[PDB]
Amino acid sequence: VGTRWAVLVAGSSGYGNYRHQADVCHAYQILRKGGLKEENIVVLMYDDIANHPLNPRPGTLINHPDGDDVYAGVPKDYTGSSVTAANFYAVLLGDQKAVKGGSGKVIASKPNDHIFVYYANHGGPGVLGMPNTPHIYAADFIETLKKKHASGTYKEMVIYVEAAESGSIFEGIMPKDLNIYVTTASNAQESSYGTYCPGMNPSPPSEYITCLGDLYSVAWMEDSETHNLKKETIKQQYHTVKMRTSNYNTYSGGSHVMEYGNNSIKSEKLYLYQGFDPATVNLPLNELPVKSKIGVVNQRDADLLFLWHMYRTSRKKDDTLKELTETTRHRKHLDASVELIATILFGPTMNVLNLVREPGLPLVDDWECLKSMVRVFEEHCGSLTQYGMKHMRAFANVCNNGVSKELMEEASTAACGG
Ligand SMILES: *[C@@H]1O[C@H](CO)[C@@H](O[C@@H]2O[C@H](CO)[C@@H](O)[C@H](O)[C@H]2NC(C)=O)[C@H](O)[C@H]1NC(C)=O
C-alpha cells in the first residue's frame, strides 16, 4: 500500500521544440486521470510554449492533431532557468536542500513507494539535453539512481526516455540490481523521430507549423489512455510501443526501442506506476482504439521543418528565410569543426574516431574525460548546442583512444582558432 510518485522532464525550449513540452504535459494529464496526486508529481519544463507569440492558440498545448488541451492544470514546479541537470538529480534523490529555486517539490519517497520517471527532448551518444547548460551526462544520471537505491527510499522504479541515441544513456553502465526497469526510444547509435508535423500525414491543424509530438512518446501515452491499466502489463506496453515506434518492423521512419535494468518488473500491471482510469474500463465496441502508420521527421531535422513551413505560410517571410539560412550554415559550420578535429588527429580516411562500439559496451570508459574534451572544444569552437550532441561519439572516442587533453587543445585551436 505505497504512494505513487512521478518525475516529468522536458529537456528543451523554443517554439521549434513545441512537441517536447507538449509530450510532458500530456503525460501529466494521464497520471492525474489515473489517480496520481499533484503533490507527488514533479514537473520540470521551460514553460515558454503556451504563451509563445507564435502559438496560434495561447494558453494551450496539444499533443495530437485532433487532441484537446493538455496544458491546463500542470504545476510550475521548475521552469525557466531552474530547469537544470542539478535540480533534476536533487528532485529524484528527494533532497529538498540541494534544490535551487522552484517550488521545492521533490521525490520524498518511502521504501514501499513506486516511482515513474519520464524524460522527453533531444539527445546524443551518452548525453541528454537540458534547456540550461550543462546537459545531462549518462554517468551522473546512473550514479544518481545508484544513490537513490542505496537510500532504499523506494520499492521499484520505471523510466521512460524519449531522446536520440537514448540507448547510450544506459548501455554498459546501467545495473540490473537497482529495482529499476528502463525503456528508451532508440538504440545507442540511431536517430529518434518526431511526429504529427506539417507537410506530412497526418498533419496538425494548418495554424500549427511545428510538430506536436514524438513517435515513441505518443506511442505509450495513446496506449495508456485507451487501455485498462489494471489489466495491461508493462510487458504488453513495451511490446506495443516497440512495434509502433519501429513503424511496424520496417524501421523506415522508425527506431529500435530498447530496454534495460530488471526485466522481471515487466510482469507487473501498469496501474502500479501510471494509475488507473475507470473511463477506459469496458469501452463500447465502436470506440476501441485502432492505430495505423504515421508520418515522421528525424528528431534533429524537426527544427528545420518548422522554419521552412513558417517561411511557406508567411517582412516576417524573410526574417524566417534568413533564420533558415543562418541555422543551416551554423549547423554545417559545427559539423565541419568536429570533422576537422577528427581529421587532424587521425586523418580523412577510415578515421578511427568514427568507429561505433558493439552493442552492450559503454560509450566511453572515462566519463570525466568526456566532459573535459567537450569543454576544450567549446573553449575554441564555441557552444556545442543541442544539435551538436549528435557528434558526442567523436569526443568519446578521443578519450577511448587515450588522446591527451593537450593534443585535443592543439587540434581544437588549429580547427577553430581564427
Ligand atoms: C528483479 O526484480 C524482482 C521483482 O520483480 C526482484 O524480486 C524477486 O522476486 C520476488 C517477487 O515477489 C521477490 O519477492 C523476491 O524477493 C525476489 N527473488 C529473487 C530470487 O530475487 C529481484 O530480486 C530483482 N533481481 C535483482 C537481481 O535485483
Side-chain angles (χ1 to χ4, degrees), residues 149 155-156 175-180 261-268 273:
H149 174 255
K155 187 172 185 292
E156 279 172 337
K176 302 185 178 184
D177 64 338
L178 302 184
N179 306 124
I180 304 177
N262 194 338
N263 269 18
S264 77
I265 298 178
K266 297 175 65 179
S267 295
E268 297 166 25
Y273 299 89

Side-chain angles (χ1 to χ4, degrees), residues 155-208:
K155 187 172 185 292
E156 279 172 337
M157 184 189 302
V158 172
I159 307 180
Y160 288 0
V161 180
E162 168 78 66
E165 292 87 31
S166 46
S168 66
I169 304 302
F170 302 90
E171 276 189 27
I173 54 182
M174 178 67 186
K176 302 185 178 184
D177 64 338
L178 302 184
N179 306 124
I180 304 177
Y181 175 68
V182 181
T183 74
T184 63
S186 68
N187 62 35
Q189 55 183 135
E190 77 189 331
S191 312
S192 68
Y193 294 96
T195 193
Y196 300 150
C197 309
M200 300 179 188
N201 305 308
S203 56
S206 61
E207 60 260 35
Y208 289 92

Side-chain angles (χ1 to χ4, degrees), residues 6 302 356:
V356 184

